Amino acid sequence: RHKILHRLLQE
Amino acid sequence: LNPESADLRALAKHLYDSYIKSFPLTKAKARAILTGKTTDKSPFVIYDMNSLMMGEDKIKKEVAIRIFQGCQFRSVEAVQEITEYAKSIPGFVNLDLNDQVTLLKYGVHEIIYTMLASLMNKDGVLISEGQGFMTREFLKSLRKPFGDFMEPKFEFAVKFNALELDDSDLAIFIAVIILSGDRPGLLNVKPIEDIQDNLLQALELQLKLNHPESSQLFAKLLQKMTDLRQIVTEHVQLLQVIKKTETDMSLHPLLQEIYKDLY
Ligand SMILES: */C(=C(/C#N)C(=O)N[C@H]1CCC[C@H]1OCc1cccc(CNC(=O)c2ccc(CN3CCN(C)CC3)cc2)c1)C(C)(C)C
């Protein structure tokens, strides 16, 4: 469920 | 001109600076490398399987798959760079985080093929940050269906490159793509369209100022936004085919995230 994209975006 | 213009100029400059910071190899440097108008070392040319192995030194089992896998590392870094760039687009990080995800998920590919054109000519494409030049014929020659991946991106690139955009134009164009209100599954379209309306105005002023002799460049460029969507759909179908007929290969998890339920 887009865990990498979530992480890139909140970084 | 007026203070409405001025806000749109300031947006253009903000996006351009952020573009420069987010993307190491700009269209400016890329064209210098490709024309020869830089006077430092040329890229290593890869035109066949022999040149590919010999070049394995200067760029970082079956070759098609080796190229496939290296292409994944590059894509993943492109997505990272594009994400950083998006976060600099005024208003973007204030959207619902789920909508931020949806916009990137659908937008990154369209930006990738936009910016890949900066790296292309009719004969081949710079790879590995300007250190390699892989020929178009060599990519067509790869065994089916791998020889099908790049050719549509070259055909797009040759027409797109004729518009002669520079980095300062591309910076706004790519922000316009990301802030598309018609992506599947968006929760709250209005704030997205409010930002895109502004970016589109900024794009239009940029093109009038930076290409004053080139009328309807704004309209020609908007029509390419639909060409980019066709490339993406055709690309995702080819990826489906590969996923079925090359059971052994594995797709990077970032790329799985993006392509999933977009197939
Ligand atoms: C990969 C291509 C090459 N060479 C390529 O697509 N090659 C195909 C034929 C044999 C292997 C196949 O790989 C297909 C593929 C695998 C995994 C992901 C993707 C994503 N598609 C792209 O075409 C692509 C990704 C990344 C870039 C990088 N570019 C640099 C700077 N950014 C800002 C813009 C984008 C370009 C295209 C396809 C590449 C050498 C193009 C990576």
Residue numbers in the entry:
A (entry chain B): 686 to 696
B (entry chain A): 204 to 263, 275 to 477
Tell me, in the authors' exact words, what the paper reports:
PPARs form heterodimers with retinoid X receptors (RXRs), recruit coactivators, and subsequently bind to specific sequences on target genes, termed peroxisome proliferator response elements, thereby regulating transcription. PPARγ is mainly expressed in the adipose tissue, colon, and macrophages and plays important roles in adipocyte differentiation, lipid metabolism, glucose homeostasis, insulin sensitization, and inflammatory action. The ligand-binding pocket (LBP) of PPARγ is a Y-shaped pocket with a volume of 1300–1440 Å3, which is much larger than those of other nuclear receptors.
Crystals of SB1495-bound PPARγ LBD belonged to the orthorhombic space group P212121 with the unit cell parameters a = 62.4 Å, b = 62.5 Å, c = 162.2 Å and contained two monomers in an asymmetric unit, whereas crystals of SB1494-bound PPARγ LBD belonged to the orthorhombic space group P21212 with the unit cell parameters a = 131.2 Å, b = 53.3 Å, c = 53.8 Å and contained one monomer in an asymmetric unit. The structures confirmed that both SB1495 and SB1494 form covalent bonds as a predicted mechanism, with strong electron densities connecting Cys285 to the electrophilic β-carbon of the cyanoacrylamide moiety. In contrast, the equivalent moiety of SB1494 extends from the pivotal Cys285 towards the N-terminus of helix H3 and then turns to the C-terminus of helix H3. Additionally, in the SB1494-bound structure, SB1494 bound closely to the canonical pocket formed by His323, His449, and Tyr473, resulting in a conformational change of His323. However, only SB1495 inhibited the Cdk5-mediated phosphorylation of PPARγ in vitro.
